[PDB]
Amino acid sequence: GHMCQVNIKQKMQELNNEINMQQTVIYQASQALNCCVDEEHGKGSLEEAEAERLLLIATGKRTLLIDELNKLKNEGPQKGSVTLSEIRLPLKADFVCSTVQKPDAANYYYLIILKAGAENMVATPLASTSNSLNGDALTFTTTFTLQDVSNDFEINIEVYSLVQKKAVRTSNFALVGSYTLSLSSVGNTKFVLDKVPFLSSLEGHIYLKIKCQV
Secondary structure, three states, X not given: OOOOOOOHHHHHHHHHHHHHHHHHXXXXXXXXXXXXXXXXXXOOOHHHHXXXXXXXXXXXXXXXXXXXXXXXXXXXXXXXXXXXXXXXXXXXXXXXXXXXXXXXXXXXXXXXXXXXXXXOEEEOOOEXXXXXXXXXXXXXXXXXXXXXXXXXXXXXXXXXXXXXXXXOOOOOOEEEEEEEEOHHHXXXXXXXXXXXXXXXOEOOXXXXXXXXXX
């Protein structure tokens, strides 16, 4: 049981405020990352990686809000569900071996961003080969459930990788793959990632379970 918006201004204001909140997070994650001048001050730590993740998330969310708001301001005069789960990201065996044979060279973190609507974005926690690897793939705890959804739904998956070796800024998490799930993806469990960087750690597929009710 939910109340409908009173007017278009209230919605715009809500979006506007959320944009400003996200910018605060961006600014603060930036200020924290700027303090990471050395290992004594947190450089190359997990804490730093988490800050990079938050910067990424707030940046991405802010972008969706901006687009929605621009959409609202250009409007003219005035059921089903999809569930994603058991996400798995297979890595190349040779990459993994390098982390074993040269474990002090770098730290590697991965995450997944799931975006459907503009107010519909979720990011998995950080995953690493140290704590998420089953077989040759990273396992994610994350379940993503989309309600009151139409049959032309799209869910954008973005895979990010962070490499740590040995004024507002941009997250060091880099986009290492993307895929758009739609109705035609239903019943499938293995998808070919687009935009995978030349010579990346990713095997190039992503695995997941899609439940769907209409």
